[PDB]
């Protein structure tokens, strides 16, 4: 029943500073301490800052300058705040307890933020089903096409997430200035079964339900 | 500020093998080292903490073994579902994770089975135009590109996307989108996706339309 | 009827250990063993069936082996959720249990949560007084509470009662409970706890003053 | 839906015969059998007594004079009867089944008895609540003291069942001739939302609930 939540901006400006928010929920500050973990995108895990269950601050040495961890034990959360923010600081930032006996265990979902002076753009969401002629072959292949986006990330499910079937979610690539990804998912009741994509953009803070039709 | 090196950074293998990732310790952490098992887009997993405790309901296929400096990963008769990234993490002074390792697995060989997709009527209205074809589920994942429009190769358009090997069925998927103006669509007529795999001896051909609906 | 010697009485096993407790027929028994399990107030449940036969439930880190005489359980890895007691039984003729043995695990230092409660005036109403200290979620087990009142240690009245190590953190918890009469309460004025713990370094004192009720 | 249950006067005095009864249920005692195994409070499990699917019977070479078992195969339940009580008789009696294949498979609750001279006291549940000047950390430790009652056992939970979590409920311990016992749980939202124990001592019929205020 132990859970953490981390709040914050998809996308901040350089030089800025970014403040995060971890919310913790099964367990006490006070007997749990709490960590930052980072993940650039593509890259893999970059512990950052540790709050112990006292109240006292660690961080990694390659940032342990523009870095601060506090917390308001009255309410349960953890706050990171970093400035003199740069590019390579755009990936999914995380938080974890550490219990003194169990580490690393419990994360947050996290939380992507991206470093850029560019301004948020929401996705163009398209439907891909047949051409106008091309028969169905029983099981049809259908997507969206979620494009002209930023910053990352925007993930997409169907039917609410009761389809699943064959997702092949495919990694965004930038244009340009902006992002272009397509999620695609196969399935036979379809005509007749209503498919449909769940896109979401949380930079943005918009969500897009694209019914793929007929044709 | 104890470095861990963590060494496999890609590992290749067949269903059933035992595979093994170490981690060493610029310092003598101790004990303290971790292992987790990371799929995309979702948040680390922890399967072993203290070198070879198992994190309840990890299957007993994996394992650790370590000390000091020096520590091991390993999972014996691999499945379809453990392909996914690892890491390692020292906890004894501090925390330090490894670079990780992509562990792959090698399948059977499979051939993609190439979709195409016209703009939808609904960007088409807005002026623009946007061609994208799927081949999705193929092994290896080694796939050609190919835009023929009326004959002619164009590539100043194209974004190719591969995706991650699915922990499902051991393949790849990839995807290819075209794009181009909504009046650049109308002085053609002829749309060949078009792929060829090392599994085809030719390409794999697959056109639309343009006319229709 | 037939004599069942188990061993070990009890046991502190490290996480992950691999745990055998062992039960000795004093006769012939064939492969009449099984084996149970009980967590504390719970009735005993059965893990293992016919000295191997796993019954459900029961995860595969548990296995029963033996011969003839000769018999144990094994835990490959023991988890904080096996804490408890165990028990074979004999049901090759009439039946018989072991003495049982208990299952504790060792953890790493955890200092108790100390938390100290006046009286309810309900209960002084009644002519007595209870002031409850708690110690709770601490590792290791040994632990030491005396009650000081305004500055004198009251050996008398007091109640201990502590936990069994809770299987779900390896931890302990403790009770005290200081009694006397509402006379002998009132006349009085600072109530301190102390507890003594390896965690500590200096005694940890928790204290409350009856003129502030 | 197989299920057994005990059940019978969990109070006697030295020297006096106990009655228990052990009904079951999703099964006939026509084709299972029942035993009956008895664990001193700290001690281990004992069988004593056990009757066969026939309704043959079978007791613990050492207790066997002081005891008798039977059933009513028909109302599906099996009797035991202990001669004689002294205090290291106290303990839970648990009845279990046998059936020829899975042995001890399905057991009861257990019945506490008591063999005592004491008599039958209900409890006294009081609040247990910071105050007094004190702190807080929005997340606090609160409790009932339920004290003073005879014999065992009594029953706590807390907010009848809404999230029961970090509750400490104590041993009881024996002092002065009477129990006591301390349940704890751990608030974050009280005293805004109530906190409230639930208390049973069925031994005096006493089924009582103490808010927690302050």
Known sequence: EVKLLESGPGLVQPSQTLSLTCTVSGFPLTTNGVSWVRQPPGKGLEWIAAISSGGSPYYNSALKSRLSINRDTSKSQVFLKMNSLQTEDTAIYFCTREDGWNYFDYWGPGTMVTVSSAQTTAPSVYPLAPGCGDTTSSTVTLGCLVKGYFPEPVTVTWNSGALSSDVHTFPAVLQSGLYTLTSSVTSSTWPSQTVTCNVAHPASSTKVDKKLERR | ?213
């Open chain 2, 1 to 213: 500020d104890i470095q861990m090196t963590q060494s496999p950074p890609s590992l290749s293998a067949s269903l059933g093998d035992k595979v093994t990732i170490t981690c060493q310790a610029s310092q003598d952490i101790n004990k303290y080292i971790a292992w987790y098992q990371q799929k995309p887009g979702k948040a680390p997993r922890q399967l072993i903490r203290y070198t070879s405790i198992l994190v309840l309901g990890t299957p007993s296929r994996f394992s650790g073994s370590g000390s000091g400096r020096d520590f091991s990963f390993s999972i014996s008769n691999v499945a379809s579902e453990d392909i996914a990234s690892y890491y390692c993490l020292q906890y004894g002074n501090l925390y330090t994770f490894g670079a990780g390792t992509k562990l792959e697995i090698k399948r059977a060989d499979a051939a993609p089975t190439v979709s195409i997709f016209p703009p939808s009527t609904e960007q088409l209205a807005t002026g623009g135009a946007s061609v994208v074809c799927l081949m999705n589920n193929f092994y290896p994942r080694d796939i050609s590109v190919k835009w023929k429009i009326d004959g002619t190769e164009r590539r100043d358009g194209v974004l190719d996307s591969v995706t991650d090997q699915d922990s499902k069925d051991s393949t790849y998927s990839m995807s290819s989108t075209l794009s181009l103006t909504k009046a650049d669509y109308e002085s053609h007529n002829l749309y060949t996706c078009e792929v060829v795999h090392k599994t085809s001896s030719s390409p794999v051909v697959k056109s639309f339309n343009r006319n229709e609906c």
